[PDB]
């Protein structure tokens, strides 16, 4: 149906601004949202359609300690939207309490936008894990929606914070955030800072403004994942039809992504498939096996090569996945995009559930457990002191992520016939 | 040509996904008159988003047998009638075969409806972290996967490769033969052929078993384990019959490759 | 039929003067009451029609200690009316006794105006609760009309005095006044000072001349509630047809109001409905549930959206009302007004019986009971001493408002099937 976008936090509002500029340049519209005559499309999912065809986006903007939100405010794309929804620490409990006191009027903003929609499919939020102001607040509003609406979906695109370890309560905050993510969300798409750092240092030579190019890559991914919605396809034009195959189980619902060019400034279906089989073309860093993989391709493809390719892909066994049961790769095609120069013609996007990401969770678990053994790294800030006097929510989150990692490590096994 | 592709072969998005979806809300002592279905069609034509043409008009939608009778079987015939100098090319026998494949592709959409129905009944009570909840959810994943591979097969053969051999088929006499081969290579790869009649024959048993699976929520675990074991028995025989029908076809070669991948 | 207006007290004559200036500017007439050629309407309910079309209002003016009544007297709207009816403390018993001695000639003024009318529908009075000169006197004339005419209706628009507590006998006076209001009146429309203070501080930045803007909002409300009378509608063009649905019960006959713009210097039926669902767009400040709600809308409405809206209004359950029985919202349409600039096109007015106002009564009850326990707050003024030597009318009023609050709290219950 219709999908409502949400954005909060400094990194989330940055990537949302980049996503809307991406879809502004991508389709034939003005930076005030007037349709271009020279351009057909559906933009009714993420944009409300007006009478002069002002495709005003379904983007609710929440801010706390605004600095870059001011730069979003005075912009030549500030005529695209004005839904009148902008409403004003670096701790999880701080952002949790700040969202707690204003939950009513932001819920009025939610219900107003819900009344703006006739039907609904899902909520996306722009969020970053352990982002400071975003952390805790995002978990709180996730709790609010999960309490309020069990009839809809939530998709979440968020990055894993790694700054190569002044902030030492960051593993605690990310742990509590991911606890709410496993239990109160239905599907998670997670990425790494380090893998995008690798691809950025390979494709280019920039080190300091890396955030900006990260925003570009996030925008390309978020357009790619939505192309079968925005360009009219004929299958999985609901989100739940896309999500249904990849997630059999309500705790292992974390999805990793890839995209075939590292630098984007013929390719055949065989080439782009085997490139997409690499972890260096995947933007997330015993043998680990996928449960299921999905691929969507967009470009100038020849339809007869593709059956040749998946024949030979069976034959070489260039993937190694065996959960326990008959769940394999799903390949799909979307339209090569007009209204932009189509260079690097064929490009693919890849979506899988793989057990290896548990190791990265385990790395964070190893850090947090170490700090939990010392118990000197909450720094006795007053916010976490009010919200839990005994700090037992950290132990509850520890036992939940223990269940999660154990479910992961059992999910590797070909005896996962039971407990799936 | 590229209009009948969208409707008679259900290639447009949010048209089949709105027509069949409104149809399945009704199902029966209803659907007994052609004044409810022909307005449901008028509601689906609005949300097609592409079309809205006189080629998207003059469609005739009828049920050759009216329902006067585990059942998954339901018929529906969608046709488009063309003017007189083009009727000699697009005959009324080719459109009838288009309706014949229309009914089967319609009967596929009932499955992604009904499995979603039992998923949605379970969704509103998603509470208990026990073994009985997760073990149930696994059967749904197993049954959804085979649907998601058989639709991807249909969404390779009848709409992509037989459409690849139609944009390079075109040459007044040759145009009639070009349409007549477009239909023939579709019905060959559609496995409506009498050579491949058993493999199409087991698919109805698959459909009826997942409907009986859908009927219950809870009533009892053991009946669901039994229905799921019947599903697994039939799927175990399918992999043997599909390799046997290549020991005696290139389009059939991909089916066994699809249903088995990095397993046996 | 025809409705006779009454006005008394400083706040009542202020809001009556503002109401008549409102209907002077609203319809096409002169400030001496000559019809404008450039202007059709009925003004026969609240104005007697003359031969040069002088619509002389049915407004009887009573004054006591006049200061602002003198400013009403020398005015460019003093040629609109002259019915020759102007006839001369801050206590309830004082105003009661002063009305008591002159009840005959003011009753002659009443009967003269009654003979001026051919038929009659109701009496409105402009009054303020605990207004000093208005208080007690207004209860006395309410007793006089309730004794005299059981064939007519009384509608009353009066405010609830809250000055954020020198005058300490004010809860006693307001209590006695509301006692006469529950037992001798048929329908009451009450408002708050604090809710209008909130809306005024939100829409504007004024604090000291708040009375003047309060008068403007009262005039807009009183025009809105009368628009289906003054502009020719076709249903509930009698007052009793409007009043009949909201009041099932003769003690719970208190009606609260709302109005969609807070600032008035598209909107759809969905938007204005959900705005009107807020208590911040309502000018009056366990779960409480309405008995019945009525809405009248005036603007540029599209007639097919309105059935869509009340479908979805059922679906979201954005109201919570369940008295015990099948009494729901009533939505109606009146004409968007010509002869004035129609900006803020669609505007709604809202009329309900809700049990929450009992709490506000209870607040006053909590104050009065506290003062009644101390018994030092009548200040031994001689007026209340003559009128009741034993002060047992206060205890009778206390038991009556106890019955009223108990009827309210039982009226919340879904076992109100009996005693309704």
Curated annotation (Swiss-Prot), chains A, C:
GO terms for molecular function: GTP binding; identical protein binding; microtubule nucleator activity; structural constituent of cytoskeleton. Its main location: cytoplasm. GTP binds at residues 130-136. The keyword Cell membrane does not apply. GO terms for cellular component: apical part of cell; cell leading edge; centriole; centrosome; ciliary basal body; condensed nuclear chromosome; cytoplasm; cytoplasmic microtubule. The keyword tRNA processing does not apply. Changing residue 360 to P: In CDCBM4; the chaperonin-dependent folding and hence the yield of monomeric gamma-tubulin is compromised. Belongs to the tubulin family. Tubulin is the major constituent of microtubules, protein filaments consisting of alpha- and beta-tubulin heterodimers. Gamma-tubulin is a key component of the gamma-tubulin ring complex (gTuRC) which mediates microtubule nucleation. The gTuRC regulates the minus-end nucleation of alpha-beta tubulin heterodimers that grow into microtubule protafilaments, a critical step in centrosome duplication and spindle formation. It is linked to Cortical dysplasia, complex, with other brain malformations 4: A disorder of aberrant neuronal migration and disturbed axonal guidance. Clinical features include early-onset seizures, microcephaly, spastic tetraplegia, and various malformations of cortical development, such as agyria, posterior or frontal pachygyria, thick cortex, and subcortical band heterotopia and thin corpus callosum in some patients. This is Tubulin gamma-1 chain. It comes from Homo sapiens. The gene is TUBG1.
UniProtKB/Swiss-Prot annotation, chain B:
It is found in: Cytoplasm, Cytoskeleton, Microtubule organizing center, Centrosome. It is linked to Microcephaly and chorioretinopathy, autosomal recessive, 1: A syndrome characterized by microcephaly, cognitive impairment, underdeveloped retina and choroid, and epilepsy in some patients. The more anterior parts of the retina, near the periphery and pars plana, have a grayish hue and diminutive vasculature similar to retinopathy of prematurity. Visual impairment becomes evident during the first year of life. It comes from the Eukaryota. Belongs to the TUBGCP family. This is Gamma-tubulin complex component 6. Component of the gamma-tubulin ring complex (gTuRC) which mediates microtubule nucleation. The gTuRC regulates the minus-end nucleation of alpha-beta tubulin heterodimers that grow into microtubule protafilaments, a critical step in centrosome duplication and spindle formation. The gene is TUBGCP6. Component of the gamma-tubulin ring complex (gTuRC) consisting of TUBGCP2, TUBGCP3, TUBGCP4, TUBGCP5 and TUBGCP6 and gamma-tubulin TUBG1 or TUBG2. TUBGCP2, TUBGCP3, TUBGCP4, TUBGCP5 and TUBGCP6 assemble in a 5:5:2:1:1 stoichiometry; each is associated with a gamma-tubulin, thereby arranging 14 gamma-tubulins in a helical manner. Gamma-tubulin at the first position is blocked by TUBGCP3 at the last position, allowing 13 protafilaments to grow into a microtubule.
């Amino acid at each position: 149906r219709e999908i409502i976008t949400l954005q909060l936090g400094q990194c989330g509002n940055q990537i949302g601004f980049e996503f809307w500029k991406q879809l502004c340049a991508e389709h034939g519209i003005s930076p005030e949202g007037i349709v271009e005559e020279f351009a057909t499309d559906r933009k009714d999912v993420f944009f409300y359609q007006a009478d002069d065809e002002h495709y005003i986006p379904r983007a609710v903007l929440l801010d706390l300690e605004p600095r870059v939100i001011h730069s979003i405010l005075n912009s030549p794309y500030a005529k695209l939207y004005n839904p009148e929804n902008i409403y004003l620490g670096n701790n999880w409990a701080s952002g949790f309490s700040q969202g707690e006191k204003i939950h009513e009027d932001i819920f009025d903003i939610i219900d107003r936008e819900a009344d703006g929609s006739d039907s609904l499919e899902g909520f996306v939020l722009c969020h970053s894990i352990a982002g400071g102001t975003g952390s805790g607040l995002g978990s709180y509003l996730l709790e609010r929606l999960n309490d309020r609406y069990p009839k809809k979906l939530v998709q979440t695109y968020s990055v894993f914070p790694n700054q190569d370890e002044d902030v030492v309560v960051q593993p605690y905050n990310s742990l509590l955030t991911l606890k709410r993510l496993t239990q109160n969300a239905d599907c998670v798409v997670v990425l790494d800072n380090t893998a995008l750092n690798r691809i950025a240092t390979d494709r280019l030579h920039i080190q300091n403004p890396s955030f900006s190019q990260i925003n570009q890559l996030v925008s390309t991914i978020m357009s790619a994942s939505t192309t079968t919605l925005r360009y009219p396809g004929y299958m999985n034009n609901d989100l739940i039809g896309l999500i249904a195959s990849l997630i059999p189980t309500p705790r292992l619902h974390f999805l990793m992504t890839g995209y075939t060019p590292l630098t984007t400034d013929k390719t055949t279906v065989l080439d782009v498939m085997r490139r997409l089989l690499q972890p260096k073309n995947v933007m997330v860093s015993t043998n680990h096996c996928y449960i299921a993989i999905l691929n969507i391709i967009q470009g100038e493809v020849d339809p007869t090569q593709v059956h040749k390719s998946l024949q030979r892909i069976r034959e070489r066994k260039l993937a190694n996945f065996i959960p326990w049961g008959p769940a394999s790769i799903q390949v799909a095609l979307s339209r090569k995009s007009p209204y932009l120069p189509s260079a690097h013609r064929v490009s693919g996007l890849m979506m899988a559930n793989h057990t290896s990401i548990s190791s990265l969770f385990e790395r964070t678990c190893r850090q947090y457990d170490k700090l939990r053994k010392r118990e000197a790294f909450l720094e006795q800030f007053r916010k976490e002191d009010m919200f839990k006097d005994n700090f037992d929510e950290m132990d509850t989150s520890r036992e939940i992520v223990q269940q999660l990692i154990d479910e992961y490590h059992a999910a590797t096994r070909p005896d996962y016939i039971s407990w799936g | 040509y590229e209009a009948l592709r969208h409707f008679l072969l259900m290639e447009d998005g949010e048209f089949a996904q709105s027509l069949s979806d409104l149809l399945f809300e009704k199902l029966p002592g209803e659907l007994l008159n052609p004044l409810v279905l022909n307005s449901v069609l008028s509601k689906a034509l609005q949300c097609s988003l592409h079309g809205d043409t006189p080629h998207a008009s003059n469609l005739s939608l009828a049920l050759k047998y009216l329902p006067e009778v585990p059942d998954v079987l339901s018929c529906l015939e969608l046709r488009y009638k063309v003017d007189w100098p083009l009727n000699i090319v697009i005959t009324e026998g080719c459109v009838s075969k288009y309706s014949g494949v229309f009914s089967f592709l319609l009967q596929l959409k009932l499955m992604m409806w009904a499995l979603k129905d039992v998923c949605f009944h379970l969704k509103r009570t998603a509470m208990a972290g026990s073994v009985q909840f997760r073990q149930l959810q696994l059967f749904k994943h197993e049954m959804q996967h085979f649907v998601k591979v058989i639709q991807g097969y249909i969404a390779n053969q009848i709409l992509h490769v037989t459409w690849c051999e139609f944009r390079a088929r075109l040459a007044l006499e040759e145009i009639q033969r070009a349409h007549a081969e477009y239909l023939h290579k579709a019905v060959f790869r559609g496995l409506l052929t009498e050579k491949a009649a058993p493999v199409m024959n087991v698919i109805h048993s698959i459909f009826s078993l997942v409907l009986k699976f859908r009927s219950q929520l809870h009533p009892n675990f053991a009946l669901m384990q039994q229905s799921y074991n019947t599903f697994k028995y039939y799927s175990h025989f399918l992999f043997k019959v599909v390799t046997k029908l290549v020991n005696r076809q290139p389009h059939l070669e991909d089916f066994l490759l699809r249903i088995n991948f990095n397993n046996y």
